[PDB]
């Protein structure tokens, strides 16, 4: 589908719902091209013969499937803002450290590796080693840091989990905004009667349990 880039939502009445749609439409074309490339690769590989293909299609083309799922979910989300990442930090403190290693958001420098390299450089300078040795000992920790940083497909699973959470949250938030005017009066009545900020669902489940326990069956 070649969706237009101009969102049809009213920004005055549903600001967040308009921004989400705008970002989704803006990045949709690029993510669609990536998804098409991945699917073409998958099907062409499946068309192969014997070891070159079918005999091992479903099981050995796992990274491609993972990329396809990540691309699909990210396309649905469109764009991710730091507020939501910090929100999900509750259940995954390393969400930013994992979401950086999955998406091409910012360029990552092996700062820890470079610091270790500088420490080794200071050691060599103290002990008067040849400059070749210290350049090699600067490269080596940097190489280790890069090797331990890139790849790391587990971060992609964690990114998928976070994106599912974020999509559910955004959908619920859109529902909140859509019906906010309808619930204004009921909300005004409710805040004056219940002094608790706990959700209605939780309170009602507790009330149902209380009735099931204490209320006489009669």
């Amino acid at each position: 589908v070649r969706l237009n880039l101009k969102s049809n939502v009213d920004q005055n009445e549903y600001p967040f719902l308009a921004k989400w749609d705008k970002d989704m439409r803006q990045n949709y074309e690029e993510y669609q091209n990536r998804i098409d490339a991945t699917t073409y690769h998958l099907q062409r590989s499946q068309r192969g013969i014997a070891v070159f293909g079918e005999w091992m299609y479903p099981r050995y083309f796992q990274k491609d499937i993972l990329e396809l799922e990540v691309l699909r979910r990210k396309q649905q989300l469109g764009k991710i803002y730091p507020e939501e990442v910090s929100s999900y930090t509750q259940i995954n403190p390393d969400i930013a450290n994992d979401l950086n290693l999955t998406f091409n958001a910012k360029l990552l420098w092996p700062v820890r590796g470079m610091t270790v390299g500088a420490g080794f450089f200071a050691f060599a300078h103290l002990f008067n080693l040849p400059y070749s040795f210290r350049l090699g000992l600067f490269v080596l920790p940097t190489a280790v840091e890069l090797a331990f940083t890139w790849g790391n497909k587990t971060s992609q699973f964690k990114s998928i989990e976070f994106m599912d959470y974020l999509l559910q949250y955004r959908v619920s938030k859109a529902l909140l905004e859509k019906n906010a005017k309808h619930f204004a009066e009921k909300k005004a009545a409710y805040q004056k009667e219940i002094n608790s900020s706990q959700s209605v669902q939780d309170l009602y489940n507790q009330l149902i349990t209380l009735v099931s326990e204490q209320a006489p069956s009669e």
Partner: peptide
């Protein structure tokens, strides 16, 4: 004194 740098250059 240490002369790694001078020797290298």
């Amino acid at each position: 004194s240490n002369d790694a740098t001078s020797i290298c250059l």
